[PDB]
Curated annotation (Swiss-Prot):
It comes from the Eukaryota. Testis-specific. Over-expressed in carcinomas. The gene is HORMAD1. The keyword Nucleus applies. This is HORMA domain-containing protein 1. The lineage of its organism: Eukaryota, Metazoa, Chordata, Craniata, Vertebrata.
């Protein structure tokens, strides 16, 4: 019931493992906070006093299995240093995945030039997850019935033009129509000597509250098969 993040990162592989964990937890927490899967499709682990919810793979909850297997293609592109961005998108009409209600962007950069310079990797990891909570606890609800789709983007100068992660085909339309007025939340970054991981959220204006001191809160691209 405990999830332990590497405090110190010394090898590229430690770093690669951390990013996969970071990607999984974030996708899991985000989908849990926005109620995209019911409570019973998540297990609970702890992150030094922080309640975290991990998506489970089970036939009992539909679509949960497909997202977990989608991550498999994300991990593959990640190890091979091909992956640039993961876009997880929420849409309502099961026939127009291009018209979306909300999405989440996960950006990756590969480096050897030490961590990020700002103006301990476990503190940063716990700050990123805590920020996802603070910045998405109070977002207005999504529509009642929603669908999930995923888009991968690569560093094309190192990626074989015919490469496909497991479960992914080459993509159709790179852009999407955002219903309403989109707001861009930059949640945060986490860096290691070898990787940078960023999280950005795009939500509709009416889902924001701007409740202040009140009583309420004082190019290659891939798609899935």
């Amino acid at each position: 019931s405990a999830l332990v993040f590497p405090n110190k990162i010394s090898t590229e592989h430690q770093s690669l493992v951390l990013v996969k964990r970071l990607l999984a937890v974030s996708v899991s927490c985000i989908t849990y906070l926005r109620g995209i899967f019911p409570e019973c499709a998540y297990g609970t682990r702890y992150l030094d006093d922080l309640c975290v919810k991990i998506l489970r793979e089970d036939k009992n909850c539909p679509g949960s299995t497909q997202l977990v297997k989608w991550m498999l293609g994300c991990y593959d592109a990640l190890q091979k240093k091909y992956l640039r961005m993961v876009v997880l998108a929420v849409y309502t009409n099961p026939e127009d995945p291009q018209t979306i209600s909300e999405c989440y962007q996960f950006k990756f950069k590969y480096t050897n030039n030490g961590p990020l310079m700002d103006f301990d990797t476990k503190k940063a990891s716990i700050l990123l997850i805590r920020k996802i909570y603070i910045l998405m606890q109070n977002l207005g609800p999504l529509p009642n019935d929603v669908c999930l789709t995923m888009k991968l983007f690569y560093y094309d100068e190192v990626t074989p033009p015919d490469y496909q992660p497991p479960g992914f085909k080459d993509g159709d339309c790179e852009g999407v129509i955002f219903e309403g007025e989109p707001m861009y939340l930059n949640v945060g970054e986490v860096s290691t000597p070898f990787h940078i991981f960023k999280v950005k959220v795009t939500t509709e204006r009416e889902r924001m509250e701007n409740i202040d001191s009140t009583i309420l809160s004082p190019r290659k691209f891939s798609e899935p098969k």
